Amino acid sequence: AHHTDCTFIRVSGSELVQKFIGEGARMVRELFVMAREHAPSIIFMDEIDSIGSSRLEGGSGGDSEVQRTMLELLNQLDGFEATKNIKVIMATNRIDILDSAL
Amino acid sequence: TKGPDAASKLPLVTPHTQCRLKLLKLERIKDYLLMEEEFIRNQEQMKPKQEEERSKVDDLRGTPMSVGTLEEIIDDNHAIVSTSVGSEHYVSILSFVDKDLLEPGCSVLLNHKVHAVIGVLMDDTDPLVTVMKVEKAPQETYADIGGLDNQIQEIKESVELPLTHPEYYEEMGIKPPKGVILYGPPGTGKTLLAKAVANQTSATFLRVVGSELIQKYLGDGPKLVRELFRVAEEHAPSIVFIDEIDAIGTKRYDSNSGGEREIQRTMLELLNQLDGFDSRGDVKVIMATNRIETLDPALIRPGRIDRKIEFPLPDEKTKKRIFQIHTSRMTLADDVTLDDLIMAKDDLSGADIKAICTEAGLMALRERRMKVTNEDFKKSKENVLYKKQEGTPEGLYL
Amino acid sequence: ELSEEDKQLQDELEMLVERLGEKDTSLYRPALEELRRQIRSSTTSMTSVPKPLKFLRPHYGKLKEIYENMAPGENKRFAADIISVLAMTMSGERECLKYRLVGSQEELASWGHEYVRHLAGEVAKEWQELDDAEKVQREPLLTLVKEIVPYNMAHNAEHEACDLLMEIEQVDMLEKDIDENAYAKVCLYLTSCVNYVPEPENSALLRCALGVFRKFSRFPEALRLALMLNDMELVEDIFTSCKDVVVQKQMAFMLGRHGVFLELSEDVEEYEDLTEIMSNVQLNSNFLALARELDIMEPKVPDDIYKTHLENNRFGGSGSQVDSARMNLASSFVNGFVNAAFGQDKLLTDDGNKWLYKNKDHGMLSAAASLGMILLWDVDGGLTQIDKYLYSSEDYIKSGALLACGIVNSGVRNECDPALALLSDYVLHNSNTMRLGSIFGLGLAYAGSNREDVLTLLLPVMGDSKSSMEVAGVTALACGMIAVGSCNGDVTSTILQTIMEKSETELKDTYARWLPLGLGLNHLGKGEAIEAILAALEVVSEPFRSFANTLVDVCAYAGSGNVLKVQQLLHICSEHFADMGAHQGVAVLGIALIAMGEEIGAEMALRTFGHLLRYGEPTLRRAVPLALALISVSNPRLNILDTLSKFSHDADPEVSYNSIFAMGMVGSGTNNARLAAMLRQLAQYHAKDPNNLFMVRLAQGLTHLGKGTLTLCPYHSDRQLMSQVAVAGLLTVLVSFLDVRNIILGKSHYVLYGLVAAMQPRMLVTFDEELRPLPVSVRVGQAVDVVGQAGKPKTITGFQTHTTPVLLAHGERAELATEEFLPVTPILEGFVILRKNPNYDL
Amino acid sequence: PIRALDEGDIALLKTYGQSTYSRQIKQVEDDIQQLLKKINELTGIKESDTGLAPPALWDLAADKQTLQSEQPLQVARCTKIINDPKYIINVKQFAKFVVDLSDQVAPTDIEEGMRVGVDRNKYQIHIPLPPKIDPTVTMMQVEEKPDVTYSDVGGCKEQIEKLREVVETPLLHPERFVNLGIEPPKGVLLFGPPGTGKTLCARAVANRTDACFIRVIGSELVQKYVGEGARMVRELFEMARTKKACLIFFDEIDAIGGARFDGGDNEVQRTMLELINQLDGFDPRGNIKVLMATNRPDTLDPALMRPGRLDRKIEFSLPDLEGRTHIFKIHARSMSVERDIRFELLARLCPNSTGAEIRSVCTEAGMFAIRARRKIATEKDFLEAVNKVIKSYTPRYMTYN
Amino acid sequence: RSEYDRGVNTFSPEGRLFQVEYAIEAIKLGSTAIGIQTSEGVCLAVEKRITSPLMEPSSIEKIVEIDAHIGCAMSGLIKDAKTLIDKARVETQNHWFTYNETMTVESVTQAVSNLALQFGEEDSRPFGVALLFGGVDEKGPQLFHMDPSGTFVQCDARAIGSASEGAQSSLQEVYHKSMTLKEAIKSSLIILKQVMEEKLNATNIELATVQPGQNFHMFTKEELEEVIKDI
Ligand SMILES: Nc1ncnc2c1ncn2[C@@H]1O[C@H](COP(=O)(O)OP(=O)(O)OP(=O)(O)O)[C@@H](O)[C@H]1O
Ligand SMILES: Nc1ncnc2c1ncn2[C@@H]1O[C@H](COP(=O)(O)OP(=O)(O)OP(=O)(O)O)[C@@H](O)[C@H]1O
Ligand SMILES: [Mg+2]
Ligand SMILES: [Mg+2]
């Protein structure tokens, strides 16, 4: 972030969780749209363990909403629309817990 | 009618390699582009009645013109229009408005002062839906997929062939499959086959994430789904691609949460639009999920998703095809025997058979070489295959 | 920074360059030698950045001055070589080339691959900058190319060699430098680049390609390029140059498919068999066999085609009892085109005369023509079935009978030529219509014959002032069709004299628009001999002068793909002023004509035509659908069909007529269910206006032509072999169609039969050397390349193993999936001779 | 030991290589993108269609006369009449006003509870208006019979007979029930595995309903504003009561009829409670036979499932062998199939498959027959389709025999 | 049902034991077997359902010799069928030993049901196999059908296996009391061909007959072709 000469949007672990359903996905979409507008840009997602954990089934146990935010992020980083000049750095301990899609 | 609003795309250049034939092709395309630009720039400038009627209509209309909802039609020159703030106004319908389109629920255009109806808003599509429409078709065509032939054939028969050659289906008497689900491990070619279909297809292509269909407000989700499918129907031949379906298609279960029950309601609206009362029309739905066991059985039942196309991890021939596809641009050396990496144990996917290529290129850059070598590829494989931790049993079985 | 070896090398190199300060005996030679060794070792390695080159940022100005002053021999050359290698990276273009030119020669390969590529680029740039004023600097560049070309040949650099050779307008070196292993790559590259590169360099490139195949003895491809240039002597020479009987048969069949009939010599073995094959007399039998295989031999009824049962019969049993002349003509055209080429029909062969009597003048003429239009490619049977109407009670039916006889013979040539004998005593016949029928019969039967007897007989027809204006236009069209794409000198002079002798008062008429049609048809595909034509046409007064000039210019460059001429046409269209609108209509048609040459051109012309349709004026909008139909003939592109459907309901009538005709032409023989449904819906919508419904039925007939077994594409053999007769007929139909009310819907409904001159089948029937039907497993798919410039035949995809015969749609290519045989011709279209593979053992 | 790149290295990498045509091609591509953007901006309109009638249709200069003379009137309902009489009018949400009629209207015309127009300045009542007819509720009607009849529903003779006894027989022939003193059930809950054919039976009933058929869209009933869904349910049931022998179809009733829990759904729960009292409770519903469908009956609130609101609970079980054969014939009637197709074997090879899977198998057989250019689908095509549709989605079968 | 169907010891609200019905469903996954009882004798026709040409056709057992006069047809689990067939053989041999007479088909079916009845009576799971017992006894030719529940009832012509419903429906139409062995065999082969996925030939069906006087005769490769020739 110091020697970057480039937009360095930061995202913490729980900033994309949100309470109201669909707020996480909307926030991720706005973040990526803003990064593309300010392109080039680097998105740092510290503690990606929060959102991006191994996917759990439905039912009361599953978190679901964080799953939707993670799916939105997955499509954004690699989906129908390919990002141009947007590099994502995610730092997270326990590499083995992150789902095998992120 | 409002026929397909197909995405625009420039023709494809075959040489790829920077040969003068590619230069000629690009020069010809640029010449035609400058041709169109000059023609349309001269038209208005070179240009020197209806003006009176337009001026009269615009002077009667005035600005700004409010957009309101028509609640009822009382007479042929009177209607009840409810402004955006919820207040109903008994406004007068002016002559210059086709009474045929004036139906309850339509978005009427009203004078700001007298509120007299002056026009009917046709599109009035939800802005969160008009974004989904694919205008610039992705450049990834079918030649950009290694293998996945059976899958390509199935997807073509579902979404591509029916438009181009409907004779076969009409004569056979079978309605072409109008729903396909793409499921398989991550990085197999699901979104790719979708991008290729969108590129080749001539029908309007709508892209969704399975997370944008969910809205914070209670009734915004089902209404957004209804608006999306109505827009798809408006353009008769359409393909709707709901990637990450497993975001909202999770198995319905008794949830003590409005969030979950709202998501379930969105899924129910989706499955009601897909196959329920009233026909779906000529809209084809393509869905992708790296998890099909967690989808509601109703959503993936025959009738809604008619072809559960499977996308397995690439085999030897498919892996060799994805190495040929992702290394064609690269300037490979003479000793690069890709078969060594192609062998693998069982778990090399396209993403890797591409990140491997990118890593080989970067390692060639490290040694200041633009031509990769076998050592570079082996190092890139060793560096980029570190995905799974164990995923294996012990030395029990013989 | 730098590493230990890095700084050591940089310091050593700085010391080496510094030792070039003063002029002791033992410094220049050792320093120069060591610099040469280091540079050669660095560059003659992997593409790694040449550390010696990167470290080399000294100044050679003192080195250059010493170079000029001392030792103009070896030391000067060594300094020049080092400086040129250095400048390979820096921007010393002129000096970068000059230091190698005047430095030590040695050899380009000794330095490095990238150096050779840079030298080739430098040579190309200098040659472009070097004009013809001085040839002194020309020879050194030729000498450099002499070695550059073999390097690219040896190190798999065919693309670079071809680019360098055709960039310096000198291609003949390939005539000797080509190799057996690389003839395919060079041939494919030049064939691909021929279309996109303009004249006159296009002519030289085509001739050099011909030379390449001739040197390699590639006869089919050499003949292909000879057709490219339309050089008849080249075709005759290639015919002479064949020693192989099987290749002889295949080439004769291919040239028959093109429609260019060369006079055969009895000396050639199997003269009778080759002539009969190239006259496609048995093509009727092959088509009937294919129809039997597809079990679609049963004739379709126009009532079934219109699907009147399915349409919402709002007026039941009362709204369909009126048989007007126009709907009768439409139904005749349908029960023609649809059932055409099958040689049978359940309503036309048996009830022809009773149905014919219900028409008036032009309508009955068209019905009589469709009489034979039912049976295409069946010469004797068609003539037997049509003679009864040829002896019809009404003498006016005779013209339609002649039209039907010509259409039956259309696409098939008989050695004894019945049509000429029939018309010999009738061409001078006083009544206009019967002579018109005879001439059209000759044109359809003898499409592209270029037989001097027909032109000589027509010359009295041209000089027959007694003939009416419509007869004059028909005669001009027939004389053009006889010599389609030939620039017939005698016909050229005849039409020239006729048009100059033409009077303005009798020129203002709408029927005077066919004379430029004939001029272009004779001069179609040859744009190097029309400047004098336009100069002569300048005599005629405006505004007809402008229309004639534009049409002649367009037909001069038919398919040449000239960007500049399309630009001039776009300029003409862009300016808004009838005849002035005729200028813009012919301009749009020319845009389509020139753009049709290449896929990129057509795809971009689609956007340009849409833009000028949504911006254009009534004349431009009217001409737009015809241009789209010409661009994508028998290529039912979904986008083009969608745009035509969008504009089919336009308030302007003539726009609707043109859109419906374009729909019919584009989907010629496609049997598109979506297109058929669209046409049915349009027919239901236009049930009130007789003309819109009539031409909707016309579009249905064109779309169902041959029951999906006939294609009107003017191109062949992977959609590149343009059909001269087909293209000429297409231009005639289009020019007659820009004004529909007077010609198509007026007193000249018989003009639409001109397009039948372009009629051709699409099929994949495979035979054996004996020509018997030989079934074989054939893969079918679209020819879409998945590689770069590897020179592959499009890497057929969408494979579908099918047993021949099979149907190949527009742009659809199938390959001989069985290595048991090797085709005489690389393509797989129509009927082929499956040569049993000797190399492979069962 | 990896070393970073320098400026000279970058320059040589981007120069030492292909540079005779690379620069030209790159510039051509960039400028072609620029030209495309320029063209798009130059046109960049796509004039949006507005409801402007053909020029001859309006051609009116008196439209300005009516605009200047006529005045917009706010619509409000007279809650009470005061006795010169005074009228209390509720202007929807604006405020409550006590206004008096203009001379144009007579006092007898305006009655309490009638919605009347008022001028925007003084709020005087100028004209009465017809009672509100909700646009969404009115569009919720069918008014277009779907083209699926009872002959297209196979394997459900008992279920179809019960459905007709519930929604059709009591309406067509009330005598058979009145004579024996039998009150026909007013509701049916079609619960079964997804794709079994509940919606098809609903469409058939709507096709031969010969009455008012209302398809209840689950989206509209769930509204953004609090209390809007209950209002929509109350308007729909009133519109059903105003008609004679109406039929309401609550498709996917599990969308809103979830089990109450303690905010959760809350608002949807309130709408569900509104439908419950409408269906059963004070103020008898009337001649409104409610049709509900759901593939998950266990999530419904017990109040909605009690046999007082959904009197007859029809179970759409997986078709038996005869049902599967009839379904195969129904879906293969149009298919160009050969005459020797043993539909019994195809029925026995789909052990537990609904009608939707049978249709999928038929379409797959047709597609297989289309793959190889054959216009007749032989029984082998059907067998392959069965393998692909059911079996697709040996050692295990080794034990069985 | 999910909470009451996890053991033969639990009673469903109907009173149904929701584990025996699952055994019947399991028997529904076997190859079709048909048995017709006529005055002349009893005929058993089945479907081979060969999975690979490498497997020995005689290895898979559908019709077995429980005794010289009673034949058994298997349809369902291989293990349960083998155990029940071995128990039937042992019971027949025990009856012959103790009583010096051939046990009646009814007696052998009762003995096999006894083992099919200990489905959890404290001296496992129900035997998921249905056996069609056909043979001739002192009462004449007979055919007996058994289901995993242990219920056995005399059947004139019973079809069990994958195609039980259709085979039985057609048998009802093609069965009469006065049939002879030849016509019964022809009808059984016709029905099997009707309800057989693969075209009938000599490698996918094994036909067994037991007539009075003669013993259990299983048609051999040559014999089967002779009968399939006309059908
Ligand atoms: N079979 C393939 N052929 C060619 N390229 C491939 C293939 N599979 C993957 N790729 C490349 O890798 C990328 C990742 O594949 P794709 O986008 O289809 O993933 P996906 O299957 O959608 O996975 P996810 O579940 O993460 O969305 C593609 O965009 C493409 O560039
Ligand atoms: N019993 C059946 N007979 C014939 N066709 C059937 C049958 N069941 C389903 N289909 C076919 O499947 C289509 C879709 O089935 P339908 O929508 O009726 O299922 P459903 O059980 O109502 O679905 P869900 O429970 O998910 O709401 C029908 O339009 C019809 O073509
Ligand atoms: Mg994806
Ligand atoms: Mg339903």
How many helical (H) and strand (E) elements, i.e. helices and strands, does chain C have?
40, 8
**The pair of three-digit structure tokens given for residue C653, joined into one six-digit string:** 């009538």
Amino acid at D104: Q
Give yes or no for residue D330 CB within 6 A of ligand 2.
yes
> If we measure between CA atoms, which residue out of C748, C618, C641, C783 comes closest to residue C702?
C641
Contacts of D398 by beta carbon, 8 Å cutoff, 6+ apart? E51
Strands D96-99 and D115-119: unpaired
- Chain B CB contacts of D209 under 8 Å are none
Which run of H or E residues covers position C161?
helix C158-167
- Chain C CB contacts of B10 under 8 Å are 603
Q: Is C182 on the interface with D (CB under 8 A)?
A: no
The residue whose two tokens read 């697709």 is: D392
> If we measure between CA atoms, which residue out of E146, E150, E145, E188 comes closest to residue E170?
E188
Distance from Cα A6 to the centre of ligand 1, integer Å: 28
How many helical (H) and strand (E) elements, i.e. helices and strands, does chain E have?
6, 10
> How many interface pairs between C and D have CB atoms less than 8 angstroms apart?
37
- Chain E CB contacts of D399 under 8 Å are 77-79
Distance from Cα B230 to the centre of ligand 3, integer Å: 25
Per the annotation, binding residues of B for ATP are 184-191
Which run of H or E residues covers position C327?
helix C325-337
- Chain B CB contacts of D206 under 8 Å are 277
Closest CB to D252 among B89, B177, B268? B268
Ligand nearest to the CA of B207: 3
CA distances from C434 to C355, C402, C422, C517 (A): 20, 8, 12, 22
CA distances from B276 to A60, B173, D195, D353 (A): 29, 22, 10, 19
Nearest atom within ligand 2 for CA of residue B276: 17
Discontinuities after residues in chain B (C–N over 2.5 A): 48
Instruction: Give the experimental resolution in Å.
Output: 3.0
Distance from Cα D230 to the centre of ligand 4, integer Å: 23
Contacts of D89 by beta carbon, 8 Å cutoff, 6+ apart? D76, D77, D78, D79, D96, D97, D98, D99, D116, D118, D123, D125
The residue among B199, B211, B261, B386 with the most chain A CBs within 10 A of its CB, best to mutate, is: B211
Residue C377 and residue C282: Cα distance in Å, rounded?
Answer: 8
Q: Is D21 on the interface with C (CB under 8 A)?
A: yes
**In the beta sheet, which residues pair with residue C822?**
C835
Residue B126 and residue D356: Cα distance in Å, rounded?
Answer: 33
Q: DSSP for C528-574, please give it.
A: TS-HHHHHHHTTSPTTHHHHHHHHHHHHHTTTT--HHHHHHHHHHHH
Which of B242, B354, B356, B359 to mutate to test ligand 1, by most ligand atoms within 8 A of the CB atom? B354
CA dihedral D91, D97, D100, D105 (to 10 degrees): 0
Do D and B count as touching (3 or more CB pairs closer than 8 A)? yes
Query: Apex CA A10: angle with CA A9 and CA A11, to 5°?
Result: 125
Residue D171, sorted as left (phi over 0), alpha (psi -120 to 50) or beta, turns out to be alpha
D198 labeled part of a ligand binding site = yes
Give yes or no for residue D314 CB within 6 A of ligand 2.
no
Contacts of C731 by beta carbon, 8 Å cutoff, 6+ apart? C517, C520, C521, C524, C555, C558, C589, C593, C630
Closest CB to D72 among B104, B114, B264? B114
- Chain B CB contacts of A64 under 8 Å are 250, 259-260, 263
Amino acid at C616: G
The chains found to touch C (3+ Cβ pairs under 8 angstroms) are B, D
Residue D113 and residue D81: Cα distance in Å, rounded?
Answer: 9
User: Hey, which bits of D159-211 come out as E strands?
Assistant: 187-191
Nearest atom within ligand 2 for CA of residue D251: 27
Residue E148 and residue A80: Cα distance in Å, rounded?
Answer: 55
φ, ψ of residue D35 to 5 degrees: the values are -65, -40
Residue C378 and residue C286: Cα distance in Å, rounded?
Answer: 11
The residue among B209, B240, B243, B262 with the most chain A CBs within 10 A of its CB, best to mutate, is: B209
Distance from Cα D193 to the centre of ligand 2, integer Å: 10
Q: Is B55 on the interface with C (CB under 8 A)?
A: no
Contacts of D337 by beta carbon, 8 Å cutoff, 6+ apart? D365, D376, D377, D378, D382
Alpha helices in C575-617 (DSSP H): 579-595, 599-615
> How many interface pairs between D and E have CB atoms less than 8 angstroms apart?
44
Q: Is E194 on the interface with D (CB under 8 A)?
A: yes
Which run of H or E residues covers position B42?
helix B20-46
Q: E92 vs chain D: nearest CA distance in angstroms?
A: 24
**The pair of three-digit structure tokens given for residue E24, joined into one six-digit string:** 């019947």
Determine, for residues A22 and B211 on separate chains, whether the beta-carbon distance falls below 8 Å.
yes
Residue B267 and residue B261: Cα distance in Å, rounded?
Answer: 10
CA dihedral C570, C576, C578, C581 (to 10 degrees): 10
Do C and E count as touching (3 or more CB pairs closer than 8 A)? no
D378 labeled part of a ligand binding site = no
**The pair of three-digit structure tokens given for residue D234, joined into one six-digit string:** 């109350």
3-class SS at D96?
A: strand
Closest CB to B290 among A25, A58, A101? A101
Closest chain A residue to B128, measured at CA: A26
- Chain D CB contacts of E31 under 8 Å are 401
- Chain C CB contacts of B147 under 8 Å are none
- Is C659 within 8 Å of C739 (Cβ atoms)? no
Give yes or no for residue D198 CB within 6 A of ligand 2.
yes
**In the beta sheet, which residues pair with residue D290?**
D187, D248
Q: A57 vs chain B: nearest CA distance in angstroms?
A: 6
Q: Is D9 on the interface with C (CB under 8 A)?
A: yes
The chains found to touch E (3+ Cβ pairs under 8 angstroms) are D
The residue among D29, D47, D63 with the most chain B CBs within 10 A of its CB, best to mutate, is: D63
Give yes or no for residue B187 CB within 6 A of ligand 1.
yes
Residue B84, sorted as left (phi over 0), alpha (psi -120 to 50) or beta, turns out to be alpha
Q: E81 vs chain D: nearest CA distance in angstroms?
A: 9
The residue whose two tokens read 């039985």 is: E168
Determine, for residues C611 and B36 on separate chains, whether the beta-carbon distance falls below 8 Å.
yes
CA E116 to chain centre: 14
Contacts of B352 by beta carbon, 8 Å cutoff, 6+ apart? B187, B384, B385, B387
Contacts of C336 by beta carbon, 8 Å cutoff, 6+ apart? C348, C370, C373, C374, C701
- Is C357 within 8 Å of C389 (Cβ atoms)? no
CA distances from B146 to B154, B321, B377 (A): 16, 5, 19
Which run of H or E residues covers position D292?
strand D288-294
- Chain B CB contacts of C639 under 8 Å are 6, 202
Residue ID of nearest Cα to ligand 1 atom 26: B186
- Is C582 within 8 Å of C513 (Cβ atoms)? yes
Closest CB to B90 among D28, D75, D298? D75
- Is C524 within 8 Å of C561 (Cβ atoms)? no
Distance from Cα A19 to the centre of ligand 4, integer Å: 32
Q: Is E16 on the interface with D (CB under 8 A)?
A: no
